[PDB]
Amino acid sequence: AHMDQKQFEKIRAVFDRSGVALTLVDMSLPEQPLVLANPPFLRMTGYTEGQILGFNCRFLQRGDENAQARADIRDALKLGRELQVVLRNYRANDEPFDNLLFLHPVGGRPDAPDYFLGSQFELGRSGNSEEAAAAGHAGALTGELARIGTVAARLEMDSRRHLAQAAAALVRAWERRG
Amino acid sequence: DQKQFEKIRAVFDRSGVALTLVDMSLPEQPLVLANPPFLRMTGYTEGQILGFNCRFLQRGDENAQARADIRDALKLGRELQVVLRNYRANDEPFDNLLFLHPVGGRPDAPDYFLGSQFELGRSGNSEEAAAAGHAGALTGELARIGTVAARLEMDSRRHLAQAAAALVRAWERRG
Ligand SMILES: Cc1cc2nc3c(=O)[nH]c(=O)nc-3n(C[C@H](O)[C@H](O)[C@H](O)COP(=O)(O)O)c2cc1C
Numbered sequence: 553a554h555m556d557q558k559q560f561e562k563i564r565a566v567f568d569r570s571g572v573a574l575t576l577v578d579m580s581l582p583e584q585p586l587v588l589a590n591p592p593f594l595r596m597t598g599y600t601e602g603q604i605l606g607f608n609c610r611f612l613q614r615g616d617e618n619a620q621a622r623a624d625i626r627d628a629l630k631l632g633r634e635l636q637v638v639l640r641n642y643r644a645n646d647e648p649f650d651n652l653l654f655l656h657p658v659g660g661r662p663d664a665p666d667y668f669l670g671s672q673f674e675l676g677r678s679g680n681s682e683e684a685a686a687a688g689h690a691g692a693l694t695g696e697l698a699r700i701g702t703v704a705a706r707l708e709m710d711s712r713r714h715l716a717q718a719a720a721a722l723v724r725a726w727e728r729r730g
Numbered sequence: 731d732q733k734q735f736e737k738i739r740a741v742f743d744r745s746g747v748a749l750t751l752v753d754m755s756l757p758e759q760p761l762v763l764a765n766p767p768f769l770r771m772t773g774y775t776e777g778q779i780l781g782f783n784c785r786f787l788q789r790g791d792e793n794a795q796a797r798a799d800i801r802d803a804l805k806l807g808r809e810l811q812v813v814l815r816n817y818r819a820n821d822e823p824f825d826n827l828l829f830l831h832p833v834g835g836r837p838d839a840p841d842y843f844l845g846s847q848f849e850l851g852r853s854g855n856s857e858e859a860a861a862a863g864h865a866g867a868l869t870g871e872l873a874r875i876g877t878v879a880a881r882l883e884m885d886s887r888r889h890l891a892q893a894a895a896a897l898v899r900a901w902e903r904r905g
């Protein structure tokens with residue numbers, strides 16, 4: 553199955569002007585390479601676009617440190633459905649950070665998406681309002697998803713509500729984790 | 731301008747948050763745009779409310795201080811978030827977390843005002859999150875209209891999200 557070149561260009565434009573970190577991965581092959589990565593993602597990770605395209609995003613990890621998170625990721629990718637998970641990640645300078653990662657299938661068939669979209673949230677970060685910030689990120693993300701087409705327009709409010717909820721919950725878990 | 735307005739219209743039709751636009755150049759400050767999530771929330775039809783001031787959502791006098799803050803922010807061309815008691819077309823009550831943002835014109839005399847309505851009391855015990863969610867979505871739309879500079883989008887999102895959460899917490903501490 554194939555997405556039109558015009559849709560792919562729409563996704564590009566969405567990425568280029570987005571105010572949230574966004575990545576796009578090719579699901580057509582098992583290596584699952586990065587194919588799009590926008591400035592807010594580049595600036596969080598300290599990389600340049602030319603450095604990372606063609607690589608799997610696991611480059612952000614070190615050793616094996618996110619075992620259960622990674623198994624949940626693999627399932628959601630094979631299934632072709634959304635997932636939010638928290639990961640220990642590292643910038644290009646090896647400084648660590650915790651990544652609230654949002655995953656969404658793009659294109660293809662219901663159980664065989666053409667791409668996967670990733671949006672990263674840094675649990676650095678703000679202060680005592682991490683829940684609000686994460687929920688805000690999720691609302692902005694849902695707006696971008698709806699522009700792409702992966703989230704049905706009529707369901708935007710419903711996705712955001714649940715997405716904002718799922719995000720705040722994860723932030724809570726992460727905060728009682730030490 | 732002319733283009734920017736049809737740009738605003740485009741943003742309104744596509745958006746997933748309730749959005750209204752009001753003309754400040756006209757004495758009664760009439761609604762000139764009301765998008766589908768707004769109509770779906772309020773149950774009014776475009777025909778009944780275009781050309782009218784958004785105060786129709788109110789009944790009686792329950793929002794005295796909120797109204798005064800609103801009038802102040804309108805005169806000054808300032809952003810504002812406030813909670814109002816409002817009513818759907820079938821009379822039913824709901825609490826409305828209203829976001830207001832100046833659009834166009836002068837920094838102190840905008841051509842239009844944008845409003846975005848977030849219904850409180852639908853989200854169970856996840857109201858803070860739902861409201862921050864709405865704020866994040868709203869900031870996205872503000873950036874596409876061009877009223878929020880593209881580079882400031884993330885910083886204004888985080889702050890709007892926090893201000894929405896604060897207002898929710900207050901609203902939960904009331905009897
Ligand atoms: C669209 C997309 C974005 C991703 N973004 C990240 C990320 O930002 N940080 C990270 O550690 N892993 C990210 N991943 C996950 C890795 O690419 C990989 O799928 C994960 O580590 C699990 O697979 P593995 O156990 O084979 O490594 C992303 C995956 C996809 C599909």
Ligand SMILES: Cc1cc2nc3c(=O)[nH]c(=O)nc-3n(C[C@H](O)[C@H](O)[C@H](O)COP(=O)(O)O)c2cc1C
Nearest residue numbers: 752783784785787788797800801814843844845847
């Ligand atoms: C863009 C915009 C959106 C507004 N939305 C609402 C609303 O959703 N609910 C409400 O009760 N008032 C809303 N208002 C406020 C009324 O239009 C009016 O400004 C307010 O009641 C204060 O003025 P007043 O005391 O003269 O009525 C909105 C105003 C503007 C400019």
